[PDB]
Homo-oligomer: A and B are copies of this chain.
Amino acid sequence: SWAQSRDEQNLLQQKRIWESPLLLAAKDNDVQALNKLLKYEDCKVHQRGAMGETALHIAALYDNLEAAMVLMEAAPELVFEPMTSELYEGQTALHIAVVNQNMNLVRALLARRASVSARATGTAFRRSPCNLIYFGEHPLSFAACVNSEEIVRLLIEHGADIRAQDSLGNTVLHILILQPNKTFACQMYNLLLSYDRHGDHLQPLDLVPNHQGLTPFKLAGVEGNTVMFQHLMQKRKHTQWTYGPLTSTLYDLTEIDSSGDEQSLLELIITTKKREARQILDQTPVKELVSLKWKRYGRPYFCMLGAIYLLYIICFTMCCIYRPLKPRTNNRTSPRDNTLLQQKLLQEAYMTPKDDIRLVGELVTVIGAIIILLVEVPPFHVLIITYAFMVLVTMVMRLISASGEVVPMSFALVLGWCNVMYFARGFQMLGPFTIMIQKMIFGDLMRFCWLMAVVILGFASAFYIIFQTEDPEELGHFYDYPMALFSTFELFLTIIDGPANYNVDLPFMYSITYAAFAIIATLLMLNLLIAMMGDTHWRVAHERDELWRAQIVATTVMLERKLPRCLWPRSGICGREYGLGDRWFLRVEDRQD
């Protein structure tokens, strides 16, 4: 009900103007009606609309220069007049005539000396999904996005600063990147850099960060505007010789590669949620870098880390498949034929120097688990952190030496093995299968488990009530309700044989009810899930090399934030020896057509 208040305040505009004879005459270009209305009788110029209108705004708004030409004699000051509030704050008609692509009142408003530094700080201008557009504050920023080139040139020649910023600190170059017209506004980026002319010592306007620290070049990758991003890259390259079809370009690589905690571009591509920002990875100075950062120094450190984790888990299972485990020298089986178990897990027997090997092997896991936690003092981290807890839980479970120590080990073990699937990504032709797991679970199953869980709560609740009458000595599939659900779930997945005795009679309802479950769930609801998961695999494998490439970048950056220098140099050829300065470049070779 929030956007309703916008429209109520927008209908009132259509009401206040409709009830005022002045501003209704401001709508239609009836000069002769305005002559009798203004020049003859006295009328106030400050008739404020629903959110701060003037008639001079309305004549600007409904494409009326001719009405606005009448106003300038009566209104010397409404040129400077802003709009009041709550959608439109600080907006004046200088902003408005720009938005309507021209009026030539833009000339006349500057002939009345309109302030070009006025800030449209209203709610409707600030960046939001609720707003269909984002043009910033200053009217110079407005003319850029609408592509009115001479009107832009009319603004610089009247002293509009290109270096002006909004509430978010975005300059006008940042606003150009946010446009869905990509190549259509890309020419404006060429135009406005020609108006850098007074070189500021701070920046030459092309490196200016916002309040969240974004240069427009880094903003281009984060917003995924590849068409913008190529064109800014055309400036960044510095080519060497060409050799027939061969060409030696030399890309800049300053903001792209990691710097002295600059928070490089490759980080912010991964951390953002805009999926089309990962289209930046296929751009040719980027794609070569992360290939070079992987084929050297990325892959062998990763494979060295993988072999350690293998020997960690093998050391874990070996001290976990060997456990103390006395015979059940304690009490006899008190429920008949129920408590089949005989071990009950020894207390403090740390003798038998085979266990001294096990004592050493137990310490290796505990030491390695703390290392993971000492890393993680600040989708797989949640596994490896909780892996380490279940090691520490069963460590404290054995120090207290309490009873239920199988459940932390069973939690630790499957999570211990399945967390080497993290290491499968650095072995291309095995990379995107992890992504196939994630979309099938979190994107498909967790929006289809909710439907299947309904049906099992029908039939398992049914089958229990059918077999409340029966002796659970024969077909004990449904002796109690909690295991009745567990029985039906394996019947849903076609695991259990299906309860059928052939020795005694079955109740009459079961044969009806099970064949119902056979149709609706075994062939029907199950294969629908298989049809879902089959579509996801084909949807993933069509694009898998981009997705493997996204894994390498996410790993390499994560390898940087968890590993110091002196064994990782930063990639790219250094400058400073070849007369190139502090910028670390890289070159690449390409045959043409």
Contact = CB atoms under 8 A, between A and B. Distances in A.
Contacts of A240: 10, 14
A414 B518 contact: no
B503 A413 contact: no
Given A340-B471, A505-B338, A587-B10, A493 B522 contact: yes
Contact of A509 (B1, B406, B477): B406
Contact of A573 (B7, B420, B465, B511): B7
B518 A132 contact: no
A579 interface: yes
Interface string A44-65: 0000000000000000011000
A58 to B, nearest CB: 9
Contacts of A235: none
24 contacts: A7-B587, A12-B578, A61-B243, A340-B474, A343-B469, A345-B469, A406-B465, A406-B466, A406-B468, A410-B462, A413-B462, A417-B454, A417-B458, A418-B458, A421-B451, A433-B528, A475-B502, A476-B503, A495-B522, A497-B497, A527-B533, A528-B533, A531-B537, A531-B538
Interface string A518-547: 110011111111111111011001000000
A528 B440 contact: yes
A216 to B, nearest CB: 22
Contact of A486 (B11, B132, B515): B515
Contacts of A101: 244
A308 to B, nearest CB: 16
Nearest to A336: B504
A210 B454 CA distance: 47
Contacts of A248: 10
A8 interface: yes
A246 to B, nearest CB: 6
A363 B156 CA distance: 80
A411 B324 CA distance: 41
Interface of A: 1, 4, 7-8, 10-12, 14-15, 18-19, 61-62, 99-101, 132-133, 146, 240-241, 243-246, 248, 296, 317, 320-321, 323, 325, 337-345, 406-407, 409-410, 413-418, 420-421, 424, 427, 429-430, 433, 436-437, 440-441, 445, 447-448, 450-451, 454-455, 457-459, 461-462, 464-466, 468-472, 474-477, 479, 481, 483, 486-487, 489-490, 493-498, 500, 502-505, 507-509, 511, 513, 515-516, 518-519, 522-535, 537-538, 541, 573, 577-580, 587, 589-591
Given A245-B133, A527-B533, A538-B531, A471 B430 contact: no
Contact of A11 (B343, B415, B429, B578): B578
A507 B410 CA distance: 12
A486 B353 CA distance: 31
A519 B535 CA distance: 18
Give the oligomeric copy count: 2
Contacts of A448: 430, 433
Given A320-B465, A476-B502, 19 more contacts: A10-B248, A11-B580, A132-B245, A132-B246, A133-B244, A133-B245, A341-B470, A344-B469, A406-B465, A406-B466, A406-B469, A410-B462, A410-B465, A413-B458, A414-B462, A418-B458, A424-B451, A523-B526, A528-B537
Contacts of A345: 469
Contact of A341 (B343, B507, B529): B507
